[PDB]
Design a protein around this nucleic acid. Structure first.
Ligand SMILES: [Cl-]
Ligand SMILES: [Cl-]
Ligand SMILES: [Mn+2]
Ligand SMILES: [Mn+2]
Ligand SMILES: [Mn+2]
Ligand SMILES: [Mn+2]
Ligand SMILES: [Mn+2]
Ligand SMILES: [Mn+2]
Ligand SMILES: [Mn+2]
Ligand SMILES: [Mn+2]
Lengths: 78, 93, 97, 105, 103, 95, 83, 97
DNA sequence: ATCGATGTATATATCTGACACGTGCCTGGAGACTAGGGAGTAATCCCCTTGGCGGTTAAAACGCGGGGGACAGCGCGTACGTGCGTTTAAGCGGTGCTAGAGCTGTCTACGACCAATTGAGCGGCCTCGGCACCGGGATTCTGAT
DNA sequence: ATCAGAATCCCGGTGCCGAGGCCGCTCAATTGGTCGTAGACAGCTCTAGCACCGCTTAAACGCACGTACGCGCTGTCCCCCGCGTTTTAACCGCCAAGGGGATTACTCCCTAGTCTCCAGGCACGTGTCAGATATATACATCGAT
């Protein structure tokens, strides 16, 4: 699952990131990092869904979550 | 003129919790700030929840879920229990 | 022939900063998302836009992060990013403790 | 009892928390459990903090909680420290922490 | 209307509704939906300006998210404003650190 | 089939006002609409506190104004106040 | 009476004292000017905002509250002075 | 005579200033500074003495927070001495300008 | 290794003003009542989500081989910590002056609120062209020599 | 530099689906209008902000010296990058089924609004003890011999 975040995918992100050379241990580190990220965002997201009494997490729950966390995103119904 | 403050309620609770213990003017002031900060933070995020759900009213359901976003775990959990307790207590009486 | 170690790296950087397409293929990511949410609530459904939103937010974030990571690498007279950089980046961001 | 505080068995003034929520434009209308709940959560936290401050005051052999005592309290508690991770306490000071590599060998 | 009466393209009505309903204050002045709709109009112009430019520069008649991103991150003042906003399908500006370049 | 609002058409009209021979994608249109709502909140919000801070019940063009001056960077603020004070006076002309 | 060069009030021993509470042991000489640089961008930010509140409150005196509101604005909330 | 070795009083001073809470910048200089900057934004301003004191409280906190993160950057670079470039990395990463 | 002085730690007594308390005065909450609209609930709908299936097709994987970057060791050169004597201005408390905040008091303009009429704005609609797709030829470098 | 030699760019042809446009309905906006109150504004007092001075001295400045750290060099060893081939599952297109979310009409509980009634909470005053300040003394450890 997590290991579904492939080495090459992580490599591309670092390239768009401006990074030239990548240590082996980075890849796993990236994963914990990404995990923590989604968790917090999805925790907040779901809380919105739980409060909206829905079995379907919407985009707006996500969007509201990212706002909460100061990582505002445009293009999904601001 | 009247300058309102949580100075009495903070005293009360301090006496309940550390009866041989006093608070300095500055310390009180700080405390007094902390209550107000967390008040807005809570109240505001509740307000967003009403709004997001096309709803005209902030009920303790809001104040609750507000709490679940704002606070970290152990703090949140206890606070929630503590809160929904006094509501229950409040209804009956 | 053979391109000198690091020269396709530079070439790839150019290619990705020029493009805006997402870099983690959707389905592994999507499966990662559902897994993580299940831990918070059972029997849940996601809007496909809800997954994209997450995806964008996450990648954009990670890229930003590599940027700042990469500066720390450089700060240490290095050219390879290492977990110790990320930790410093995040530390200073005030993400991690 | 008359005080809504007493009906809820709380130290915090539920009447105040009620007025504020209205003179504050958070919504048209306010429920009646929301003040109660909030007035209580306010209490949990002032208590939770005052507890750790007093302990801080105690170790520093003192009768009276001064902001260092609140500061020590806050930044020693993983969780409180995060609630107030972007906040400054007048006269707080910082936690005694000296990096390894700066220590003599 | 009132968009007319203020030379604005932006719905001066819509705005007055939203301020009253979005719980910002008890009462809401007559000038403010106009002042604000204007500032909203002003800023959406500056973006549309520099993005369009960017779409010309990038040789297209239609503005895609990238053109917005380029317009935004290249503008020093706009970039600040949207300092905490990730723009979907924005990509990044091209920037490669010196010491990474070949010798 | 629900009648969901946006700023789409006005964004367009303003697009024509600045780049007459240019168009837009739906994906970028969302971003423009998001941008508008975000900016609307931030300004409205600031204005809201301003009122409170000053023990007053009304959000006037003035409140909006100073909100703008706290929310915006030196130059962008500057023009904004212009267009703001302009359209207002021009509004108070007509009736 | 006119005011000039006051940033140099921020003497070097103080910019030192702060660095010590900051856990810094060894201080490069080019630090003291950069710190003043930074402190200035910092005070220019809080006071631009503090002042904007003072102007809105239609006042000639800047209050503890205008300051505190400014900090809150800049995400540097401060307890101890009202609010 | 007697002479403490280099770095010995630094460590002492750290511990001194980490025990206390009293402000480190002198009171009067500080005020003169703030009155300047404010003048140059609008003339003819007065201050509640507590309002200066607020800005200072807020100022020192920041700089001490700053030095903290600067210090980390020095250490990141296998160094022990803080340098403008360190501060500069902290601020880029904090996302200050 | 033993020896001395330095700073810190601590013990005292000492003097001071801030917290914490009691008293009394008032404003914000309690109490009791109404009338109205929000929200909750139940009843129907259809849209969106999931699911499962199979085809090419790119992407993931994996390994191989060697190059250059990390890292550790060393040494040079010098900047920054320390101390002391000299020098400057902060902090103290004490006095004097009025500007401006904050509290006050009247009148009315501007906003909310209600109702009735009108087109601005949205979804639904189709056709059409800006642009994603590409196969060939134009250039602009990279590494080898 | 000078070479071929990749890989990338720019170009002309084709092609398809979302832009951007119009069709017409409807619901949000606008109009005309009443009512009252938030806040403008002029009057008035009373806090605290500024100013200015001198006795005191703690802090800041400036220079001298050398120590130990910044950094520049080297030298080794291996951890990543490049690249060719071998292995998986991403993706797309296609249909199928029911969950849940969306919309609608109804009643009743709950909350705003309003009034009269009074102690919780405030300022105000006051007296004393926690804590700050000054000064002597013992304990620890760093660096010099
Ligand atoms: Cl409630
Ligand atoms: Cl107005
Ligand atoms: Mn000046
Ligand atoms: Mn020895
Ligand atoms: Mn006057
Ligand atoms: Mn009116
Ligand atoms: Mn050459
Ligand atoms: Mn072409
Ligand atoms: Mn009034
Ligand atoms: Mn169903």
């Amino acid at each position: 699952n997590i290991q579904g975040i492939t080495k090459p995918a992580i490599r591309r992100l670092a390239r768009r990131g401006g990074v030239k050379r990548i240590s082996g241990l980075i890849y796993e580190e990236t994963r914990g990092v990404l995990k923590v990220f989604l968790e917090n965002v999805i925790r907040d997201a779901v809380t919105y869904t739980e409060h909206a009494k829905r079995k379907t997490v919407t985009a707006m729950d996500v969007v509201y979550a990212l706002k909460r966390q100061g990582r505002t995103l445009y293009g999904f119904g601001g | 003129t009247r300058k309102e403050s949580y100075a009495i309620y903070v005293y009360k609770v301090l006496k309940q919790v550390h009866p041989d213990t006093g608070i300095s003017s500055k310390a009180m002031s700080i405390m007094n700030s902390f209550v107000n900060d967390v008040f807005e933070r809570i109240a505001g995020e509740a307000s967003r929840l009403a709004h997001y759900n096309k709803r005209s009213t902030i009920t303790s359901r809001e104040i609750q879920t507000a709490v679940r976003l704002l606070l970290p775990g152990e703090l949140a959990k206890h606070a929630v229990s503590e809160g929904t307790k006094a509501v229950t207590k409040y209804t009956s009486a | 022939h053979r391109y000198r170690p690091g020269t396709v790296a530079l070439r790839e950087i150019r290619r990705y900063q020029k493009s805006t397409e997402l870099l983690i293929r959707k389905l592994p990511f999507q499966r990662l998302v559902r897994e993580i949410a299940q831990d918070f609530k059972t029997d849940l459904r996601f809007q496909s836009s809800a997954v994209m939103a997450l995806q964008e937010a996450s990648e954009a974030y990670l890229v930003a992060l590599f940027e700042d990571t990469n500066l720390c690498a450089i700060h240490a007279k290095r050219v390879t990013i290492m977990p110790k950089d990320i930790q410093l980046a995040r530390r200073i961001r005030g993400e991690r403790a | 009892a008359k005080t809504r505080s007493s009906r809820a068995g709380l130290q915090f003034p539920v009447g105040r928390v009620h007025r504020l929520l209205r003179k504050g434009n958070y919504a048209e209308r306010v429920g009646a459990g929301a003040p109660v709940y909030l007035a209580a959560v306010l209490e949990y936290l002032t208590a939770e903090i005052l507890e750790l401050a007093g302990n801080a005051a105690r170790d520093n052999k003192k009768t009276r909680i001064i902001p260092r005592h609140l500061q020590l309290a806050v930044r020693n508690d993983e969780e409180l420290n995060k609630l107030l991770g972007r906040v400054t306490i007048a006269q707080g000071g910082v936690l005694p922490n000296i990096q390894s590599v700066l220590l003599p060998k």
